[PDB]
Amino acid sequence: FVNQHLCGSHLVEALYLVCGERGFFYTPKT
Amino acid sequence: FVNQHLCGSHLVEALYLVCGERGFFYTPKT
Amino acid sequence: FVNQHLCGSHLVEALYLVCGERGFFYTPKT
Amino acid sequence: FVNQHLCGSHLVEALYLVCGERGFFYTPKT
Amino acid sequence: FVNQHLCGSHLVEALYLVCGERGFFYTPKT
Amino acid sequence: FVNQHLCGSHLVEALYLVCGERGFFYTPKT
Amino acid sequence: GIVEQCCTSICSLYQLENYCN
Amino acid sequence: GIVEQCCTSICSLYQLENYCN
Amino acid sequence: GIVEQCCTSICSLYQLENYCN
Amino acid sequence: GIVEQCCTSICSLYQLENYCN
Amino acid sequence: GIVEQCCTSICSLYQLENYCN
Amino acid sequence: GIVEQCCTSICSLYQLENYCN
Ligand SMILES: [Cl-]
Ligand SMILES: [Cl-]
Ligand SMILES: [Cl-]
Ligand SMILES: [Cl-]
Ligand SMILES: [Zn+2]
Ligand SMILES: [Zn+2]
């Protein structure tokens, strides 16, 4: 796999693909 | 607003929209 | 809900989620 | 180009692609 | 159709819509 | 990671995620 | 309408231009 | 859970706020 | 307008709701 | 091909790398 | 190339069509 | 954190995998 530059909603899409049925937590600063 | 079917990556896009900086969890196993 | 920073296609996605079956109009300047 | 099935948020992404600065309306009730 | 300003994943979405079942190749520099 | 169903524009988003700068081909006819 | 033309049925990028402003 | 409430069934933007942190 | 405001500054879902049909 | 492996069936992120250039 | 042109300047759907199979 | 790192610099899928449930 390659390294990623991911902002906003694109990060959430990536988490979705990576984690699949496991789900994930999205926890930004502040 | 409205009620619609939100699945998969569309569901997580909607969570990101609604929660944003708060963060969220997507835990489909439940 | 939280405030939004939305450019290009991300704005249209947000309108879609917000309006649902009501539909919407996308009307940029110029 | 081609003809494909375009539904929901994919349909609006396609309208944004095709119309852009012109703007568009998405009015599924008709 | 209108002219497009497309970066990252948004370019791939556009290629998908334009090419449909024909498919496409995504070939960035470097 | 995981295994999930990836179709259409979601499939190409996943190829972009996984391949990035390498590039990729999406050739559904096969 | 658009849903019938493009989702239920199948439509071209040209047909989609019918819904531009 | 969320899949049942929002994908299988139908949910509002308000219901989605139930899954914020 | 809304398109520009959401992009150059910020906007709320409630402001967006004004553009629904 | 890819549609059969990943859409109709189920595939991993590793399998998707098969379609990189 | 196309990837860079679409991002740093602009590109048309007709230019994109050249990358179809 | 990860959210900021992916955006201001770069991040890998393996770093992302740490945020799965
Ligand atoms: Cl979907
Ligand atoms: Cl869908
Ligand atoms: Cl962006
Ligand atoms: Cl889909
Ligand atoms: Zn979809
Ligand atoms: Zn973007």
UniProtKB/Swiss-Prot annotation, chains G, H, I, J, K, L:
Lineage top rank: taxon: Eukaryota
Q: List the disulfide bonds.
A: 6-11
Membrane-crossing ranges are: none
The name this protein goes by in its record: Insulin A chain
